[PDB]
Design a protein around this nucleic acid. Structure first.
Ligand SMILES: Cc1cn([C@H]2C[C@H](O)[C@@H](COP(=O)(O)O)O2)c(=O)[nH]c1=O
Ligand SMILES: [Ca+2]
Ligand SMILES: [Ca+2]
Ligand code: NA
Ligand code: NA
Ligand code: NA
Length: 316
DNA sequence: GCCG
DNA sequence: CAGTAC
DNA sequence: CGGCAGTACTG
């Protein structure tokens, strides 16, 4: 990234817009920042900037200001509420609408939230683990967590496949959470193994809090045994074997990579989700499409006309 | 905010 | 449903 | 002008 002296400035504005609820302007800013990071050739002109995809006239003027004047004046008018809104919306379960409500009510600190705010169960758990959830763990610990869940699961059925996805699967040195995807090549055993698996993990003391409990998805909190351990975010999902590939893609991310693949699919009349890649999905402005066989991620790429990207090149 |  | 998360 | 990904728990 030869343009850090621009992305540094633009990330602040993107975050201000994001915490203040201007989701689409924040998205545009983020895509332009990805463009900047991906150029590998320091932009040294307004025409070179205005010519990069994801970067238009507004962003070109911002960048030219940063280039010549070494500073962007918009940054001097970020609302004073932004640091408080960021503090509040880093609580798991609270987003921009709750952060802004809390701000309007006069709250300015987590002590205010603790003593005065009305919290959901999820928010009370997120506040209780605030510092822990802001940390990333070494991928070695992620391995230990994956293996804990895989041992718990493979006791019910040694044929179950358990794969840790997310940044872990993209090969990052640290991970903000662990996301375990479970399936069985038999196609008809992933029923009941989910509830009993969670009962097992809870009996061992491994699971400490539940955030979301659905028929297919679990999101919660775990902690490995012993000293020097923190609480970590853990997701577990169980899927039929026929969806395994599409799950692996989706839950491996990144989020920008997925959103790009899904935009592309949408262009070619297809629809891509965590369940299936469908074709001739009818839309406008009920679209029961046809599911396409995707036994491997490579098949998803191929059906979309793309070369296969390994998980490590999927940052955006 | 960007792009069709 | 709106809000939130993935 | 208008989409910007698509799906699933909570309350
Ligand atoms: C944050 C986010 C992630 N994802 C996908 C890509 C991430 O690698 C995967 C796991 O999410 P995570 O990074 O929060 O654990 O979920 C989405 O589909 N949408 C989102 O908004
Ligand atoms: Ca991750
Ligand atoms: Ca614009
Ligand atoms: Na461009
Ligand atoms: Na939050
Ligand atoms: Na996750």
């Amino acid at each position: 990234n030869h343009n850090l002296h621009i992305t540094e400035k633009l990330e602040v504005l993107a975050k201000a817009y994001s915490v203040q609820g201007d989701k689409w302007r924040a998205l545009g800013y983020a895509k332009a920042i990805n463009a900047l990071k991906s150029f590998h050739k320091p932009v040294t002109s307004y025409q070179e900037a205005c010519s990069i995809p994801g970067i238009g006239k507004r962003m070109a003027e911002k960048i030219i200001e940063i280039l010549e004047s070494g500073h962007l004046r918009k940054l001097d008018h970020i609302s004073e509420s932004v640091p408080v809104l960021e503090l509040f919306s880093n609580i798991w379960g609270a987003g921009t609408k709750t952060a802004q409500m809390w701000y309007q009510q006069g709250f300015r600190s987590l002590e205010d939230i603790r003593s005065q705010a009305s919290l959901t169960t999820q928010q009370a758990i997120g506040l209780k683990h605030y510092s822990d959830f802001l940390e990333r763990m070494p991928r070695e610990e992620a391995t230990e967590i994956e293996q804990t869940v895989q041992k718990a699961a493979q006791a019910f059925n040694s044929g179950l496949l358990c794969v840790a996805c997310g940044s872990y699967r993209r090969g990052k040195a640290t991970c903000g959470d662990v996301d375990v995807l479970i399936t069985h090549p038999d196609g008809r055993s992933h029923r009941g193994i989910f509830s009993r698996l969670l009962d097992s993990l809870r009996q061992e003391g491994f699971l400490t809090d539940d955030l979301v409990k659905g028929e297919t998805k679990y999101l919660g909190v775990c902690r490995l045994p012993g000293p020097g351990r923190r609480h970590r975010r853990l997701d577990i999902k169980v899927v039929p074997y026929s969806e395994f590939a599409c799950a692996l893609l989706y839950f491996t991310g990144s989020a920008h990579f997925n959103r790009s693949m899904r935009a592309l699919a949408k262009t070619k009349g297809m629809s891509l989700s965590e369940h299936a890649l469908s074709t001739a999905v009818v839309r406008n402005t009920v679209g029961p499409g046809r599911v396409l066989p995707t036994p491997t991620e490579k098949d998803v790429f191929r059906l979309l006309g793309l070369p296969y990207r390994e998980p490590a090149e999927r940052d955006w």
